[PDB]
Amino acid sequence: GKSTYKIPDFTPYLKKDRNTDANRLFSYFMIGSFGMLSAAGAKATVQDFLSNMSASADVLA
Amino acid sequence: ASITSVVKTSELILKSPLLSKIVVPLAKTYVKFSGYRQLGFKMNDLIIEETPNMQLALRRLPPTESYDRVYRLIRATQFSLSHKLATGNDITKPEEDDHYLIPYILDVEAEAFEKDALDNLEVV
Amino acid sequence: ATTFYNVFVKRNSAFVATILASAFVFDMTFETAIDNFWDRINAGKQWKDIRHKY
Amino acid sequence: MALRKKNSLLNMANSYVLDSPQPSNLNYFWNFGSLLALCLVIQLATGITLAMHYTSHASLAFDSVEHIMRDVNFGWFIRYAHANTASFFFICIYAHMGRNIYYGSYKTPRVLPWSIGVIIFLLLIITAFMGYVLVFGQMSLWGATVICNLVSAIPWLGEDIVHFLWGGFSVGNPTLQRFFALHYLMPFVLAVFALLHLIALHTAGSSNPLGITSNVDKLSMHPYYSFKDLITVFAFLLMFTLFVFFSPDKLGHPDNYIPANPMVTPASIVPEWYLLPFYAILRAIPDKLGGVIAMVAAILILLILPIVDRSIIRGNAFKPISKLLFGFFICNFLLLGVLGQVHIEPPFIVLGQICTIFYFSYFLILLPMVSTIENIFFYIGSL
Amino acid sequence: YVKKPSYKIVPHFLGFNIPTVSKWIPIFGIWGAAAGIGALFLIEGVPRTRQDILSKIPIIGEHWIREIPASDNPF
Amino acid sequence: VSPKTRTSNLKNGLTIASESNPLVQTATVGVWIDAGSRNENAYNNGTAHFFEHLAFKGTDKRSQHQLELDIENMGGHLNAYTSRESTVYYAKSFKDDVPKSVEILADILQHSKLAESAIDREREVITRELEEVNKQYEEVVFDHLHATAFMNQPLGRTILGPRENIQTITNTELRKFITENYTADRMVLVGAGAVDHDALVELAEKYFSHLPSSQSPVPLGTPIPNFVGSEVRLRDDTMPVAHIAIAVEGVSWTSEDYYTALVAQAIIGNYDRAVGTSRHQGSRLSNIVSENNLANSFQSFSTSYSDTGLWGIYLTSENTTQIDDLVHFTLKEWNRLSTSVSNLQVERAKSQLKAGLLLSLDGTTYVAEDIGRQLTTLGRRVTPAEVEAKLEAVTEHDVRAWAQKTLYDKDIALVGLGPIEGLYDYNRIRNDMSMMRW
């Protein structure tokens, strides 16, 4: 309430293993999974969507 | 190109007797046909200035030289828009076409090129 | 597990390569897995299930 | 503080069209930028109007253009205006690029507006090529066939890409409908890039015909260049009038008034006049893929002007040798244009190759050599 | 006694020198792989990519050898 | 080639270490103690610094006034400082005034009065010190930096201690602190300049012989710190200059990477616009900052403790609208320790350090501080030959390997003080700890 060197209580949020490689890696696994599904989803979206421009069924007949 | 490059190459030519004998007369004719003197410019007024190096060199000009340069540029711009040429005292005579800027840009570039060299030094 | 971080995650070039290779694998396996799942829940309904009569 | 400066939207307009500080000595070749903007506006207005009467289906397309000519009130004017302005757009764009090359507008600090400009030029070519196909006359079809077959040269995937462009196994309805949609779109993309190259330019300001700084002597864009731009607007409109009203088909190919017929091949399949130099460059290389690469390289090589021009001086106003070289380069570009429309016969075959070599050697050899030599002549010449 | 510092200027161009670039050679490698994987992934659907590339891969390649039975193919 | 540092022990386990210099006429003797603020708990935090005040408030023999006079009569001065891990008490004097000074130091350390009246008097003096450090911005920044980096841990505490403790420190707990901590096996008597080693050992046998030994004598410089990536902003728009420190968890004195971290620090280096030569420094960051006027100064540091460290940079800038660029460019220069450093930078920094580590020692006080520091952190003085060999062993590959494990994509502790509106939020700062292009 007065001293600025007394850091406020962060114990409710601090991870004990915060500096471990396991700790960083886990968060990057979530980011990477999100990147992976975004890539797979984008590929699917692009491929299906652009296929509209390939010969339609009536042309292929 | 760098002014350094231009100046070094020109000095190689002015050294060689053969080369100077054939190049000096050509260059003088070239400059006559170039026709920048007909707008009251000195050669150095024409050098591209929108470069960090050249901005630095222009800042290093003595105030007098700098004020006169601004006048020649303004005067030439007015001749250009009027489609007129300089007459009389406004025409740059060969003796007035002094390289007022070349020493300043050569110093700026010398330091910039030394900086590049020394950024690549390897202790032996 | 430091090893895993160092190999696949530390360099972004490696991380993006890993993500794209994983996307490739996911895309191919997910396709196959859904195909099989779809055929099981719609068993005896689809053309492939009645085609054998003809 | 004045409203035009205070309000953020007005201030953007103000910064481009009113208080914009311009050099006080721009000559008439600085007027092509506004003419190109006028062409772009005419093309949007006439194009959107044609789109209200045109039908993209191959069974109806040619007839819909006849319907526009014959039935729609002033349809003849809107059609001819759109078709002729496409030609004027290229005259003005070549003039604008010519101005930029002669006056060294591509040099620092204006490399970015120049480089975006090269992309605008490519989009204009694509836009105009697709628009030509929409008529679905003989030249429309056969031009689409031969130009789209160039993509067949791309190794491995080339054939597949062509079938993908066509939406089919030949140029037909799917191709026509997709070109309609893209031809409608591409001018808006072109307008965005045109705006980007202006925004890029606004950091350095316009160059000027002396190639020196204009920071010392500026003029508001309005009223001075506003009223100067009017002169060329009216000169342009006079030229527009003589084509559109009095000779609307002088720039056209008669074969485009014959409906597309995939069986009959026309006598001579040539692109529109403004693409002819690139067509000559393509013919010069015997290899199919080589030819395509050369043709693209003929445009993309403009991107290296900032590098290969070694001059310490911006532009050609004061460089007699560079001016002569530029003159030859321009005339060669026109010869290439002419050789683009001759028959592939002696002696034009060899001539086309020599002109193509001259075209590339300007960027790769002559400009770097000449600009280096003139640097030396200015220095020694003024000692 | 040392009279002069002992150094050379290494060859350089546009602020790149061989020592520095050599450190990045592996990274271009990985980005090239990433671009390869990514490009190939994008065109995995293209029939020519399957026919010429993907079906030839050992073990895995049978994933891309799929025939429509002639009874179910209108074309 | 410097004279040999002689080292002797006493019976109790007091180390005596001396480096004689027959070229000088002054001598610095003092006691380096392997004890400091870190040895307090939360209840007695501030005791170590409190004691430093009381040490000069009079002994069992000499009163406050007599003490003052005795030192004045010696001719030199006494000085003390307490840090987190180390307390020093030294006396700079004339050559032949060394027996007086050792006697005075032994007296103020062993036989201090700590009278209730003097405790009460200093309790106000120290309370006023809480509101005047506020001006010393570098120390403000570094005190917050430790507070945050080692949040709720012993290293995270200040030296002064909280206001609350200053009001409640008793002579009992002061006595208990110096009885538990100021033990012979934790102390080094150091002499530099015009001292004879054998004379100093005799003075130690005379004055420091009845020192307590600790129950469990561990070696000198024997210590669990868990760094917290975190930020403190102390925004103050009335200040004209922003002060920013950025640190990661660095290396301890005895790390195998200690020299690698020094070399890395020297690659980034220091800069000060007020020094003439600084615009011409080789450091890439120096060039970026000077050309763009991004900062008044920056100072790389590598602070070490017994079991951890902080490695980072301290920046000062008046350019309040371009602090973003300053921090951006700084962290991108650190990224290049991981991605780009080659023999070019590493050999240049080694050259600069090979001299720098010897140049620092230019007066008897600096020599004594070097002997004292080394003896209390490593248990020995490292000879210049060994220092030169350890630096020579640092390769470019070592620097890159160290940076990739210590800097690259790591959490930072970040403290900003002053007009720091332009300093972006923690994420954007921490995002610059990696390069997406790599």
Ligand code: HEM
């Ligand atoms: C739709 C097409 C275009 C429009 C509407 C357009 C418009 C303009 C305008 C209004 C200007 C400023 C005034 C002027 O100098 O004329 C300009 C300048 C410029 N344009 Fe374009 N432009 C177009 C296409 C191009 C192309 C294709 C290029 C280059 C290949 C280009 C390169 C430039 C450059 C370099 C400048 C700066 C020239 C200078 O002032 O020195 N533009 N343009």
Ligand code: HEM
């Ligand atoms: C840069 C802008 C444009 C250029 C260079 C351009 C070019 C062309 C060209 C060369 C043709 C062939 C004309 C003919 O010989 O009949 C054409 C046709 C057409 N354009 Fe455009 N065009 C542009 C913008 C637009 C826009 C914005 C639309 C909006 C839909 C459009 C719609 C059409 C239509 C419907 C036709 C077919 C009718 C016809 O041939 O007249 N154009 N365009």
Ligand SMILES: CCCCCCCCCCCCO[C@@H]1O[C@H](CO)[C@@H](O[C@H]2O[C@H](CO)[C@@H](O)[C@H](O)[C@H]2O)[C@H](O)[C@H]1O
């Ligand atoms: C730079 C980007 C790269 C270029 C982008 C490529 C564009 C077009 C590529 C593939 C499009 C056609 O490629 C084709 O995709 C469709 C899905 O759309 C797949 O088709 C598969 O799924 C669809 C529904 O998902 C079914 O109707 C079909 O019976 C089945 O075979 C084909 O197995 C694949 O061969």
Ligand SMILES: CCCCCCCCCCCCO[C@@H]1O[C@H](CO)[C@@H](O[C@H]2O[C@H](CO)[C@@H](O)[C@H](O)[C@H]2O)[C@H](O)[C@H]1O
């Ligand atoms: C040509 C078509 C007409 C419409 C104009 C184009 C619309 C898009 C323009 C906005 C793009 C950003 O454009 C940018 O805007 C700001 C303010 O407007 C300009 O800013 C400039 O003018 C204002 C005052 O006039 C000053 O505060 C500023 O010092 C100066 O640089 C930039 O020089 C311009 O680069």
